Paper text:
KRAS, the most frequently mutated oncogene in human cancer, produces two isoforms, KRAS4a and KRAS4b, through alternative splicing. These isoforms differ in exon 4, which encodes the final 15 residues of the G-domain and hypervariable regions (HVRs), vital for trafficking and membrane localization. RAS proteins act as binary switches, transitioning between the active [guanosine triphosphate (GTP)–bound] and inactive [guanosine diphosphate (GDP)–bound] forms. We present the structures of both the active and inactive forms of KRAS4a, as well as of the complex between KRAS4a and the primary effector protein RAF1 and compare them to previously reported KRAS4b structures.
To gain structural insights into the active and inactive states of KRAS4a, we solved the crystal structure of both inactive (GDP-bound) and active (GMPPNP-bound) KRAS4a at 1.8 and 1.6 Å, respectively. The largest structural dissimilarities were found in switch I (residues 30 to 38), which is visible in both structures, and switch II (residues 60 to 76), which was disordered from residues 61 to 70 in the active, GMPPNP-bound form. Unlike GDP-bound KRAS4a, the switch I region in GMPPNP-bound KRAS4a is in a conformation compatible with its binding to downstream effectors. In the GMPPNP-bound form, the KRAS4a and KRAS4b structures have higher similarity, having an RMSD of only 0.37 Å due to similar conformations of switch I for effector binding. For both GMPPNP-bound isoforms, there was no interpretable electron density for switch II from residues 61 to 70, suggesting higher flexibility of this region in the active conformation. The overall structural similarity is high, especially outside of the switch regions; the two structures have a backbone root mean square deviation (RMSD) of 0.74 Å over all residues present in both structures. Because the observed RDCs represent time-averaged measurements over a timescale of approximately 100 ms, the distinct and more complex dynamics present in the inactive, GDP-bound states of the two KRAS isoforms led us to refine by RDCs only the GMPPNP-bound active state of KRAS4a. The 20 lowest-energy structures refined with RDCs have an RMSD of 1.1 Å, while the RMSD between the average of these structures and the starting x-ray structural model is 2.0 Å. Overall, the RDC-refined structures are less compact than the crystal structures, with differences in the position of α1, which is connected to the highly mobile switch I, the β2-β3 hairpin loop, switch II (highly mobile), α4, and the segment from β6-α5. Some of the structural displacements relative to the crystal structure likely result from the lack of crystal packing forces on those structural elements when in solution, but others could be due to the intrinsic dynamics in solution that are damped in the crystalline state.
Numbering used by the authors: 1 to 60, 71 to 169
Write the structure that this text describes.
Amino acid sequence: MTEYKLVVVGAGGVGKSALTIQLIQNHFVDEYDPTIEDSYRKQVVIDGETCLLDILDTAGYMRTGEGFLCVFAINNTKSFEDIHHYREQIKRVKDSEDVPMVLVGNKCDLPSRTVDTKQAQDLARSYGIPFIETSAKTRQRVEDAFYTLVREIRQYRLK
Ligand SMILES: Nc1nc2c(ncn2[C@@H]2O[C@H](COP(=O)(O)OP(=O)(O)NP(=O)(O)O)[C@@H](O)[C@H]2O)c(=O)[nH]1
Ligand SMILES: [Mg+2]
Ligand SMILES: [Mg+2]
């Protein structure tokens, strides 16, 4: 079983825990319980590779993580602004510009959007990483988000 150490980062309340619990448990957490630091391990098959995912759900690990899910909420402009701070801190710690990352715009089921998809696409394009729009509430593209991050790490290891 190939291991992938994934770390979910982003401002408070953007749905990091909700996305992680949807992946692990197939259950939407409606209550907002602020996270300290939670670890999960899940065995999955991704593109035919049997994988062990080690997911660290952080509070709103930069050394141990191999790939980072950088989450903002599409109805929280400040959380989108704060992404740069998360990425720059990761880059500093890993002393690298190619660390595997996926940009996640969560809560896409909410109509009170203030981060336009074009803004998010331009940021992702700049960093050289994928962009996935999710909803933990409806479980839209939750697996896609985490599996895309796995694939980024896989491609990184193979150059
Ligand atoms: N409508 C909607 N609400 C969501 C979605 N994802 C999370 N939420 C809601 O937003 C709140 C915060 O979700 P939660 O996962 O704790 O946030 P978090 O980033 O883990 N926060 P923290 O940093 O404090 O640990 C919860 O009420 C949750 O139900 C989503 O896709 N859609
Ligand atoms: Mg949390
Ligand atoms: Mg605007």
